[PDB]
Amino acid sequence: QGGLEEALRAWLREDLGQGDLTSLLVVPEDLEGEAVILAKEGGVLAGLWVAERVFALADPRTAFTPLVAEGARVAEGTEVARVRGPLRGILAGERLALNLLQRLSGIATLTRAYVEALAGTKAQILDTRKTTPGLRALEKYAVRVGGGRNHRYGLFDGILLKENHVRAAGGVGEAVRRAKARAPHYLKVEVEVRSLEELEEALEAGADLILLDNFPLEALREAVRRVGGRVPLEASGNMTLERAKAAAEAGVDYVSVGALTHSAKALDLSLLVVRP
Amino acid sequence: WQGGLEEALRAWLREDLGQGDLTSLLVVPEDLEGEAVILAKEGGVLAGLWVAERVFALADPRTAFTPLVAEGARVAEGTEVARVRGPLRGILAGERLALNLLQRLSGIATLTRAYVEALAGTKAQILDTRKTTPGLRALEKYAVRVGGGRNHRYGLFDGILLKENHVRAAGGVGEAVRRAKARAPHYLKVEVEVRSLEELEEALEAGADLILLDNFPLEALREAVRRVGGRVPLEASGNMTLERAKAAAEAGVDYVSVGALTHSAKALDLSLLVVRP
Amino acid sequence: WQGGLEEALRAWLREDLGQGDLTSLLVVPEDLEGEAVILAKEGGVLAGLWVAERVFALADPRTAFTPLVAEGARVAEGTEVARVRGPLRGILAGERLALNLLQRLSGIATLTRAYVEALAGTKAQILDTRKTTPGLRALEKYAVRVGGGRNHRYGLFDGILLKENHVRAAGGVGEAVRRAKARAPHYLKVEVEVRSLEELEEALEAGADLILLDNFPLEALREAVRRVGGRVPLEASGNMTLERAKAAAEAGVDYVSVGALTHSAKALDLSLLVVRP
Amino acid sequence: QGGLEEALRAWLREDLGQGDLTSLLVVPEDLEGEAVILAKEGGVLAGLWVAERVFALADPRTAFTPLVAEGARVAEGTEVARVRGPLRGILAGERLALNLLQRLSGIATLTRAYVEALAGTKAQILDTRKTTPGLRALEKYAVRVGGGRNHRYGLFDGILLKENHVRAAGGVGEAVRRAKARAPHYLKVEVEVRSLEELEEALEAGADLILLDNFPLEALREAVRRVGGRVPLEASGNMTLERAKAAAEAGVDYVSVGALTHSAKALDLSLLVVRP
Amino acid sequence: WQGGLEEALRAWLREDLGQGDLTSLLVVPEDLEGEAVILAKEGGVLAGLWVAERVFALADPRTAFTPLVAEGARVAEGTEVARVRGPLRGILAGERLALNLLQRLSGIATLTRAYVEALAGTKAQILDTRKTTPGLRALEKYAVRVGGGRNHRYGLFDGILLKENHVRAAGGVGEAVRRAKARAPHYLKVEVEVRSLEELEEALEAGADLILLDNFPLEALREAVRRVGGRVPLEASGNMTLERAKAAAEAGVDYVSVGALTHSAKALDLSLLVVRP
Amino acid sequence: WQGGLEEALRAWLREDLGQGDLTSLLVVPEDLEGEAVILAKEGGVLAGLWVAERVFALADPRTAFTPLVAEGARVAEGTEVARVRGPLRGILAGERLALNLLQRLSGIATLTRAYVEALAGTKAQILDTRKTTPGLRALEKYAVRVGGGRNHRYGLFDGILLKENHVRAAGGVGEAVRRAKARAPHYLKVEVEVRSLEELEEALEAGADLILLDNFPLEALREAVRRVGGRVPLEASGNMTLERAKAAAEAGVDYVSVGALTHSAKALDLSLLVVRP
């Protein structure tokens, strides 16, 4: 939780304003109907319960029935869910519900592809902070549905020394030391390194976690060897399915992927009313 | 601007900052000054420059955001689009949200401009849709305008648009149109989506003010334009691509609505380069 | 309903209640039950019954609001329109706001119904305006609907209406209309206000979709209708009274916009009668 | 103060939404202009500074210049103010500014009529709680501009035993006593009475203030005589100009008038753009 | 409470929960529902039970709160104040907020009856002040009432109290009291604080309804009641300790406002223990 | 602060001002601007100066706040902490809120260096807890830092801490620590509270990153550090008084979290006196 209810009402208002003028014109007030949400392409479903809430907010008399499980992979033409109740309510919540379902499913679909690519390895997929403003909690949820894990929610709950912090501190060593000197005792100090020398600095300074930023595959393998499992290694930077897989086989423990939320194409879904 | 953006930006910054940027507070001196530039890693259209300016100001009012190009200007790769100088902490605190928005809106403006140019030489205009990001509609519609496109209705409250679901609910295109024309708010035009030339005829004869051709193959599109003969404006939509939008425009439609503009526009590659420290 | 009403009602109750109803807390026992009825002191149209129900519920969820007539029903003097029973404190806490709203909205619905009836026998319909109470527009437009009237645009964001000030700013009626027609959002009709038969001709010839006749004397109104000959819908406005609205309707206009509906409607005389204690 | 700034922004948004589409069409972005606010009937002006703020919120480049003082009585055809700056801004704030100015001026006009009717007496005019939801602070302000005084802002800052409280307590005496027994020491206990007998009860129970509810004129005079200035007397209930005046001449100290805010006709005002 | 307590509680719950109670999500099943009990690991007065119950309801509506002792009742170590049943995650989620409030409010209710019992036997009544916790005034003022005390004004908007800064801003106790008495609402009493009896007189004849004695030496504290003969309520103020308070009550004052009731009142040690699993 | 402190301050100011500061409006001219000075009628550590300055700025932007001593600096009775100049109404309006905060936050900053100085000489560092004032956590946690202390987690969302209720909800210190260590975010350390050394061992080998000793008798408090050899941070918890805290620091613990720093910390006596007029 985190105020989702309030957010959904605000997004519904964004679209509804004073009311759905088109539907009020051609759909009787007491006309009940049924609609089907169809997948227009293959992928993974995420956000079914969110869509249910959207329709409920539009009109509490609506009933949402999923025909697939949350996180299930479906084929093109598959019936995802059925919605029944006052037709005006269904038509009012349709666009918002679909906008959310398509977006979350899109994220879960790409995440699932990355996770499956890492099958056979101990490596886990992580998200990042490259999320849609206002939708972070929902998008982080989508990642979990896809099979991935969540990295920090923001700048307030995790210590991650990035290149800019290293530059400010005058080096990886200084950054890791300034951090471990006054960091919350319940948080681990992670630092990003861009070369094998910085990796050595990080290990020497006492970093709890080390992020290998844009390491070529050969350097990544060498990093894994040198660390010898002493500290967890995270790989990130311009990640693709092939690169995440390679990094995993090379032996890293985590692969954070910006693409999961920064460039995930929405899953094409539609809602079709059942002819009265 | 309408309003509410200020409140939305504060909430989005809060989403990321919470009680504070712990990492920066740990290693970055409060008085350490920062100097950075936002670089375009690829060519494209800039949108949201003033939005990014406001986000940095919310992170720390002492930060100075200086635009180096005009809002809506198309820049080449390597172009420094803005300079930011002030407390490094404030810069690092606002960086993520500022760029996220700048990249998103610029990406929309860039794709929109591509569609606009694809219609060059014709009278057709590009329109947006309601396939927008929850909570970002005002900003995304703004980005479409920056790119040169036009806005269709903001939501369900300011336009009559009989979609396939309304047609199915009313029992037919002519049926839905006649019902709407009989009671529609007098200041709104009655538009209806049609999927065939037969449905097009129903719309025309029932008195539709606007007709949206839904995923018509090129041959049918041309025939629709010929038949209508300018009696009513025609809006083409459905799985648009630059090629299809151009074909529809050359076929003679008046508008081409593109969901992709706000539903699948790739973010523009922009990065914040800290030059000092 | 759109939304926000819940939040608005809470704020309005807070405006009156603050930290609490001191007087009632001083002399009314917490468990003392109350029983009251809302009486119509004069005949009129009821609107806002469900709004009053919600206000009482916000004051105290244990209170039971029971409507005795239908929403929008016209009642005669002495009609008990609703019964409220529950903790007397909660009843006294919500009384003022509940009735204030009930009286206001009922008053609007009552006047609107009077204008609607004045147009009986003609095809003309009554329209509201933007001369509404700040913060109450959604509720007042709702009241107009309850009375039988129609709503014009909600604000400046959902309708193109070239008013006298736009005409003056553009240098003329034909000038303003031609400019608007050239770039107006395609889903909106272009309406323009005119003050003379000459301005009416400018509007017609420039392609206006809608024409609003501003304070036309009866003779001119008739002439305007004859000339237009049904080419475009005509909306009459300006210092409306029941007599003038009826005259305009019999003259042949399609719509009569009435500012008085929401700008000067007298509140309906309704009172809360506590029968016990 | 009390959040007026936030309220004005919300009311502006009520009308503006995504933007003033009509003005954007025919008024150039950089076109500067001037408009005049004219009184279309005689009355008293209230809320000039509020209108100024509305135009400022629409566009801070606008300049508002009053041509009459706040609270001044003007004749039909009088120029109330001039507004200059970006024309789009003026046209965007016009309706809201006028809606507020007309409403507040309407209240101040009727209040001023009541106040002038009481000239020659010590009686003061008071308002009531019959105010427009959300506009109480502004309407109470309008009353002051008109020359009246403010009664309690709500149920939280004043003790007023009404007929319903008397019924609940089992009588005026019991109500006044239950009240004075546990009432805040910084507040006066006022009680409404509807007959000379209840008046006697009130005086006997120790009421600090007594409100004569719908007393015929003859009874009102008798009440003033009996009280002999021992406690302040307030008269209220179906007040008209003539009744307030009579009550004042009869000798009451205060006359609270619901009509000031419950049935005050707005002052007719308009805004006309100066031809470019 | 109709004063927006719900919105406050939700906000305070979010201040603590954020994205979610990570710990409980890691080790506590979503389907596992348990039972807990609130324990008073100390002796004192209980206040805020209904507040705690609404915290749990907001955390998880499926939670069942059962108060075992009446509000305001005095408890001893080990006393089961209440038992909550339902989804264990919801209980662990609202635990900390529910207790911070119960403990805080119980502390005030406990310390207040301290004074009430202290200066008992007399007529003096204990009053609070405005030295409350920002945002918690309503709840804290409620705590005092539960402990047997009474409330002074809720803010600067509902009461007239001329303080030292006012007096010097005006130029004396005399005029300041005159400026106030000259245009003060007719339903409000004018109260002024004085430091010398040259000022107590300068006020008593200035027409003051209430008088506040600031850091009065007791030779004057019990003199003042004598020189006033109980004509206008007397309120003692300053460093009102348990002794200097009961003393004033002995001196005969009508009210004793203790700013320490909420400016230095330790929380009542309370705890929530899971008894199942 | 970028954490929405502005909105909080505005809300707290309204809690006190409401419709307006009646008293000051009655006796203080609108054009009269004076000067005031904040005085510390006690000895302690100052914290919240910038908070007070923003209260005055929000009350009346024309107010000039001038801090005379640095934040966190220790002051003695009579020390002029700061001087404010400008419209006297604005100063009297923000006075009470500015002081409630300055006093409250200064009290925490004062009491915190108490501990910091107390267990000084050792390596132990003072930490806060979640037993903070609802809605004031951010500000209170800040106070601790000013007094020389450090912050523990801000809520249940940014830290893993297995408490007694968790342990029993799971079925032991062992599994609970395993369930957490099994799926805990990779950037977080798992901390668990234990009551017996059969549990300290059941945790140390369960793979815990942090250990919290709850109401440890000191024969075990200084044993535990010995049996841990400083492998995992040690945090002492329970009734941590000034003695039981400095003791733990003597025993060698790494951190001592004092829940009394904000659950029972008296405000630092401060006042604002008008010096002109």
Side-chain angles (χ1 to χ4, degrees), chain F residues 131-145:
Chain F
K131 294 182 180 179
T132 50
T133 305
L136 294 182
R137 179 163 294 167
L139 284 175
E140 289 183 350
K141 275 199 159 60
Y142 164 74
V144 174
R145 295 200 298 284

PDB file of all heavy atoms in Angstrom, chain F residues 131-145:
ATOM      1  N   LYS F 131       9.506   5.669  18.124  1.00  0.00           N
ATOM      2  CA  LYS F 131       8.588   6.178  19.135  1.00  0.00           C
ATOM      3  C   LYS F 131       8.657   7.700  19.063  1.00  0.00           C
ATOM      4  O   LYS F 131       9.082   8.363  20.010  1.00  0.00           O
ATOM      5  CB  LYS F 131       9.003   5.702  20.530  1.00  0.00           C
ATOM      6  CG  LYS F 131       8.888   4.203  20.743  1.00  0.00           C
ATOM      7  CD  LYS F 131       9.279   3.824  22.163  1.00  0.00           C
ATOM      8  CE  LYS F 131       9.172   2.328  22.384  1.00  0.00           C
ATOM      9  NZ  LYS F 131       9.577   1.941  23.768  1.00  0.00           N
ATOM     10  N   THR F 132       8.247   8.238  17.918  1.00  0.00           N
ATOM     11  CA  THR F 132       8.260   9.676  17.669  1.00  0.00           C
ATOM     12  C   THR F 132       6.843  10.237  17.647  1.00  0.00           C
ATOM     13  O   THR F 132       5.869   9.488  17.643  1.00  0.00           O
ATOM     14  CB  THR F 132       8.905   9.994  16.306  1.00  0.00           C
ATOM     15  OG1 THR F 132       8.307   9.164  15.305  1.00  0.00           O
ATOM     16  CG2 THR F 132      10.408   9.749  16.336  1.00  0.00           C
ATOM     17  N   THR F 133       6.738  11.560  17.617  1.00  0.00           N
ATOM     18  CA  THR F 133       5.439  12.219  17.580  1.00  0.00           C
ATOM     19  C   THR F 133       4.836  12.115  16.179  1.00  0.00           C
ATOM     20  O   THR F 133       5.447  12.541  15.197  1.00  0.00           O
ATOM     21  CB  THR F 133       5.563  13.709  17.959  1.00  0.00           C
ATOM     22  OG1 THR F 133       6.206  13.829  19.235  1.00  0.00           O
ATOM     23  CG2 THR F 133       4.188  14.354  18.037  1.00  0.00           C
ATOM     24  N   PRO F 134       3.625  11.543  16.070  1.00  0.00           N
ATOM     25  CA  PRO F 134       2.954  11.392  14.776  1.00  0.00           C
ATOM     26  C   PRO F 134       3.026  12.671  13.948  1.00  0.00           C
ATOM     27  O   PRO F 134       2.609  13.733  14.406  1.00  0.00           O
ATOM     28  CB  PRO F 134       1.525  11.042  15.172  1.00  0.00           C
ATOM     29  CG  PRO F 134       1.727  10.240  16.426  1.00  0.00           C
ATOM     30  CD  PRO F 134       2.771  11.050  17.165  1.00  0.00           C
ATOM     31  N   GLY F 135       3.577  12.563  12.742  1.00  0.00           N
ATOM     32  CA  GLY F 135       3.690  13.713  11.858  1.00  0.00           C
ATOM     33  C   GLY F 135       4.929  14.569  12.053  1.00  0.00           C
ATOM     34  O   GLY F 135       5.207  15.453  11.244  1.00  0.00           O
ATOM     35  N   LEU F 136       5.683  14.306  13.113  1.00  0.00           N
ATOM     36  CA  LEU F 136       6.880  15.087  13.404  1.00  0.00           C
ATOM     37  C   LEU F 136       8.173  14.286  13.323  1.00  0.00           C
ATOM     38  O   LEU F 136       9.240  14.800  13.659  1.00  0.00           O
ATOM     39  CB  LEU F 136       6.784  15.695  14.807  1.00  0.00           C
ATOM     40  CG  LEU F 136       5.726  16.756  15.091  1.00  0.00           C
ATOM     41  CD1 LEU F 136       5.873  17.228  16.529  1.00  0.00           C
ATOM     42  CD2 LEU F 136       5.897  17.922  14.142  1.00  0.00           C
ATOM     43  N   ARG F 137       8.084  13.038  12.876  1.00  0.00           N
ATOM     44  CA  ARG F 137       9.263  12.181  12.796  1.00  0.00           C
ATOM     45  C   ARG F 137      10.470  12.825  12.122  1.00  0.00           C
ATOM     46  O   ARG F 137      11.554  12.872  12.703  1.00  0.00           O
ATOM     47  CB  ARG F 137       8.920  10.866  12.087  1.00  0.00           C
ATOM     48  CG  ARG F 137      10.112   9.920  11.939  1.00  0.00           C
ATOM     49  CD  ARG F 137       9.653   8.512  11.625  1.00  0.00           C
ATOM     50  NE  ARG F 137       8.910   7.926  12.736  1.00  0.00           N
ATOM     51  CZ  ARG F 137       8.183   6.818  12.645  1.00  0.00           C
ATOM     52  NH1 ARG F 137       8.099   6.172  11.491  1.00  0.00           N
ATOM     53  NH2 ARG F 137       7.542   6.355  13.707  1.00  0.00           N
ATOM     54  N   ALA F 138      10.287  13.326  10.903  1.00  0.00           N
ATOM     55  CA  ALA F 138      11.384  13.950  10.171  1.00  0.00           C
ATOM     56  C   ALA F 138      12.074  15.039  10.984  1.00  0.00           C
ATOM     57  O   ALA F 138      13.299  15.060  11.088  1.00  0.00           O
ATOM     58  CB  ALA F 138      10.877  14.524   8.852  1.00  0.00           C
ATOM     59  N   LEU F 139      11.285  15.941  11.558  1.00  0.00           N
ATOM     60  CA  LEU F 139      11.826  17.036  12.358  1.00  0.00           C
ATOM     61  C   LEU F 139      12.501  16.569  13.640  1.00  0.00           C
ATOM     62  O   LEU F 139      13.534  17.114  14.038  1.00  0.00           O
ATOM     63  CB  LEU F 139      10.722  18.043  12.692  1.00  0.00           C
ATOM     64  CG  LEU F 139      10.315  18.955  11.533  1.00  0.00           C
ATOM     65  CD1 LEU F 139       9.140  19.827  11.939  1.00  0.00           C
ATOM     66  CD2 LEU F 139      11.503  19.816  11.130  1.00  0.00           C
ATOM     67  N   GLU F 140      11.913  15.569  14.288  1.00  0.00           N
ATOM     68  CA  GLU F 140      12.475  15.039  15.521  1.00  0.00           C
ATOM     69  C   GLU F 140      13.764  14.270  15.250  1.00  0.00           C
ATOM     70  O   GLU F 140      14.734  14.398  15.996  1.00  0.00           O
ATOM     71  CB  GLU F 140      11.451  14.150  16.231  1.00  0.00           C
ATOM     72  CG  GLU F 140      10.299  14.951  16.837  1.00  0.00           C
ATOM     73  CD  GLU F 140       9.307  14.100  17.606  1.00  0.00           C
ATOM     74  OE1 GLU F 140       9.378  12.857  17.524  1.00  0.00           O
ATOM     75  OE2 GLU F 140       8.445  14.684  18.296  1.00  0.00           O
ATOM     76  N   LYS F 141      13.781  13.478  14.180  1.00  0.00           N
ATOM     77  CA  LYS F 141      14.982  12.731  13.840  1.00  0.00           C
ATOM     78  C   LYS F 141      16.098  13.719  13.522  1.00  0.00           C
ATOM     79  O   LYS F 141      17.279  13.434  13.740  1.00  0.00           O
ATOM     80  CB  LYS F 141      14.723  11.790  12.657  1.00  0.00           C
ATOM     81  CG  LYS F 141      14.125  10.456  13.084  1.00  0.00           C
ATOM     82  CD  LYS F 141      14.294   9.383  12.018  1.00  0.00           C
ATOM     83  CE  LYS F 141      14.181   7.982  12.617  1.00  0.00           C
ATOM     84  NZ  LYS F 141      12.859   7.732  13.273  1.00  0.00           N
ATOM     85  N   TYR F 142      15.717  14.889  13.020  1.00  0.00           N
ATOM     86  CA  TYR F 142      16.678  15.937  12.703  1.00  0.00           C
ATOM     87  C   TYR F 142      17.247  16.508  13.998  1.00  0.00           C
ATOM     88  O   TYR F 142      18.436  16.818  14.084  1.00  0.00           O
ATOM     89  CB  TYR F 142      16.006  17.072  11.927  1.00  0.00           C
ATOM     90  CG  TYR F 142      16.827  18.341  11.908  1.00  0.00           C
ATOM     91  CD1 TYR F 142      17.971  18.447  11.119  1.00  0.00           C
ATOM     92  CD2 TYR F 142      16.482  19.427  12.716  1.00  0.00           C
ATOM     93  CE1 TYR F 142      18.752  19.597  11.134  1.00  0.00           C
ATOM     94  CE2 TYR F 142      17.259  20.584  12.737  1.00  0.00           C
ATOM     95  CZ  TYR F 142      18.392  20.661  11.944  1.00  0.00           C
ATOM     96  OH  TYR F 142      19.169  21.800  11.958  1.00  0.00           O
ATOM     97  N   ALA F 143      16.384  16.657  14.997  1.00  0.00           N
ATOM     98  CA  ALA F 143      16.793  17.198  16.288  1.00  0.00           C
ATOM     99  C   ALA F 143      17.905  16.346  16.887  1.00  0.00           C
ATOM    100  O   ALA F 143      18.887  16.873  17.410  1.00  0.00           O
ATOM    101  CB  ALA F 143      15.601  17.247  17.237  1.00  0.00           C
ATOM    102  N   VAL F 144      17.738  15.031  16.813  1.00  0.00           N
ATOM    103  CA  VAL F 144      18.731  14.104  17.335  1.00  0.00           C
ATOM    104  C   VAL F 144      20.084  14.365  16.678  1.00  0.00           C
ATOM    105  O   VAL F 144      21.100  14.485  17.362  1.00  0.00           O
ATOM    106  CB  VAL F 144      18.308  12.645  17.080  1.00  0.00           C
ATOM    107  CG1 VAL F 144      19.423  11.694  17.488  1.00  0.00           C
ATOM    108  CG2 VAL F 144      17.044  12.338  17.860  1.00  0.00           C
ATOM    109  N   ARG F 145      20.093  14.464  15.352  1.00  0.00           N
ATOM    110  CA  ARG F 145      21.330  14.723  14.627  1.00  0.00           C
ATOM    111  C   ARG F 145      22.007  16.006  15.110  1.00  0.00           C
ATOM    112  O   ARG F 145      23.231  16.068  15.221  1.00  0.00           O
ATOM    113  CB  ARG F 145      21.064  14.828  13.122  1.00  0.00           C
ATOM    114  CG  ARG F 145      20.580  13.538  12.474  1.00  0.00           C
ATOM    115  CD  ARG F 145      20.820  13.573  10.971  1.00  0.00           C
ATOM    116  NE  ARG F 145      20.089  14.649  10.304  1.00  0.00           N
ATOM    117  CZ  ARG F 145      18.783  14.624  10.052  1.00  0.00           C
ATOM    118  NH1 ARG F 145      18.053  13.576  10.413  1.00  0.00           N
ATOM    119  NH2 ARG F 145      18.209  15.642   9.428  1.00  0.00           N
TER     120      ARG F 145
END
